[PDB]
Design a binder for this molecule. Structure first.
Ligand SMILES: O=C(O)C1=C[C@H](O)[C@H](O)[C@H](O[C@H]2[C@H](O)[C@H](O)[C@H](O[C@H]3[C@H](O)[C@H](O)[C@H](O)O[C@H]3C(=O)O)O[C@H]2C(=O)O)O1
Ligand SMILES: [Ca+2]
Length: 490
């Protein structure tokens, strides 16, 4: 028996958690096993470990006439809310009030987080992934390549074009081959963010393809004429091979591949893990220096960083209607928001990945000096996963090197980060229109965006058809309710 036990009799519950297009919940995870030890509740995974589409797996699960005890994963907020109001997921308000002191105290001290997760009927249907920190992504460029080619740090988009063209054409890795790929990214969605260079938005928040507000008006980036004109330029950079030809396919290990083989010249990615490549490749590529770069002055004369940490993220977990132990489940959920539970969900397992030194969790040297970024290492053992948990920036600070720290400081100091969209409060019937049309519109927008970038569709020629399709798919019905909700609140 332990003091943290939420049940005297051992309990096993079924969880469907397919996430980030690769992983599933693993009961064998060191973190999972430690939480199970301390709480006396074991979670067994039922999701298909072979699938590469997490959202599709939720859809198949929901339509399969069977439900597990718990459903977790990334980008599930909208589905948690929709199916919660339908009755597939249970409300957590009373369960938290009566059984979850850590969460109850958390929500009282974080009203913005409570607001962001609450459904229009007043019910909380899931517990969120709550990130910790301020900045997220920044531009990184190969300083050693700039220096070798005798080029200054590009200050404008036009200067950046010249630099990236030089990376492509002037053999900075010195192997006599045109193998260099100037701009790379592990996130395909970042290719759309390049429209920032031409004064267009790609998203209002850390949530991909999110709405934004300009002069009291709700806008979606992909529907704007600025996007049409901006994506033409992105298409041109793709055509000229300045953007990775595999930008939509390469994905997770883009940095390991392109920086590891000394072909990648630039990216836009998180400060800590990206800067860590300087240390990992220090001997393999003598002089490798990937440095934070201020955003280039765009066509609107400004230096935009569009991305920032989003608190909370639209990720987490929920309790289903079929769950026969909702009290034990919410108590398990609450363990994650206590001191020890939070530490485990962030740092891993004590004696394995970290040690308590002077009362503080300190990562082992084997973790810090490892080839893999620490967040990657955490995923492997069941930490830093998109369950209902509260991230602790102290975990990240420990593997944020001086290059990363100084980049973070520069971005904070110079205020590059654009004001982030914190959402509007929809009514139930407004949300019905939202949930009906928006997911499919977003998918269509991505497909069109990819077609435009890759040159299979001409953005100028197809814009009229695209706008008609947006209307036919109900996008402007969604836009009407978005503006209505905004006008009501503000
Ligand atoms: O890389 C970091 O330095 C970093 C620090 C933070 O502590 C945090 O771990 C951050 O993680 C984010 C990063 O994009 C990861 O790759 C991952 O990304 C997934 C997420 O759903 C995201 O929307 C992206 O499009 O794809 C997912 C993926 O795993 O490929 O998690 C992110 C997060 O916000 O937790 O990385
Ligand atoms: Ca070369």
């Amino acid at each position: 028996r332990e003091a943290t036990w939420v049940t005297e009799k051992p309990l096993t519950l079924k969880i469907h958690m397919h996430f980030r297009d690769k992983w599933v919940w693993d009961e064998n995870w060191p973190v999972a096993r430690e939480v199970a030890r301390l709480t006396n509740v074991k979670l067994v995974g039922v999701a298909n470990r072979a699938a590469t589409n997490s959202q599709e797996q939720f859809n198949l699960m929901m339509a399969s006439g069977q439900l597990p005890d718990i459903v977790g994963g990334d980008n599930l907020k909208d589905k948690f809310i929709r199916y919660g109001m339908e009755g597939a997921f249970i409300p957590l308000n009373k369960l938290i009030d009566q059984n979850a002191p850590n969460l109850k105290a958390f929500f009282k001290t974080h009203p913005e987080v409570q607001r962001a997760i609450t459904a229009p009927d007043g019910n909380i249907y899931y517990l969120p992934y709550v990130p910790d920190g301020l900045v997220s992504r920044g531009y990184f460029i190969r300083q050693d390549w700039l220096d070798k080619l005798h080029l200054k740090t590009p200050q404008t988009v036009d200067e950046l074009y010249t630099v990236l063209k030089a990376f492509k054409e002037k053999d900075p890795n010195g192997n006599g081959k045109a193998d260099e790929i100037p701009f790379i990214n592990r996130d395909p969605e970042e290719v759309f963010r390049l429209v920032n260079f031409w004064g267009a938005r790609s998203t209002g928040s850390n949530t991909w393809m999110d709405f934004y507000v300009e002069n009291g008006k709700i806008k979606h980036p992909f529907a704007e004429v600025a996007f049409k004109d901006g994506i033409k330029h992105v298409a041109q950079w793709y055509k000229e091979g300045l953007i990775d030809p595999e930008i939509f396919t390469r994905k997770a290990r883009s940095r390991e591949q392109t920086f590891g083989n000394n072909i990648g010249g630039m990216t836009h990615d998180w400060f800590a893990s990206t800067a860590l490549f300087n240390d990992a490749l220090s001997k393999n590529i003598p002089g490798f220096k990937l440095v934070p770069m201020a955003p280039p002055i765009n066509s609107k004369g400004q230096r935009w960083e569009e991305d920032a940490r989003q608190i909370p993220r639209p990720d987490g977990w929920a309790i289903t209607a079929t769950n026969k132990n909702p009290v034990e489940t919410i108590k398990l959920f609450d363990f994650y928001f206590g001191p020890k539970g939070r530490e485990l969900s962030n740092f891993g397992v004590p004696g394995l990945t970290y040690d308590i030194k002077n009362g503080k969790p300190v990562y082992k040297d084997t973790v810090l000096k490892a080839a893999q970024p620490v967040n990657n290492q955490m995923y492997d053992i069941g930490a830093q996963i998109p369950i209902g948990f509260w991230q602790d920036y102290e975990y990240e600070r420990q593997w944020t090197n001086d290059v990363a720290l100084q980049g973070i400081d520069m971005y904070i100091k110079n205020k590059y980060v654009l004001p982030q969209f914190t959402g509007v409060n929809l009514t139930v019937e407004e949300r019905e229109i939202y949930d009906k049309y928006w997911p499919d519109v977003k998918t269509y927008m991505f497909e069109m965006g990819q077609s435009w970038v890759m040159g299979t569709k001409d953005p100028e020629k197809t814009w009229n058809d695209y706008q008609q399709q947006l209307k036919n798919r109900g996008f402007y019905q969604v836009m009407i309710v978005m503006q209505k909700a905004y006008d009501r609140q503000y």
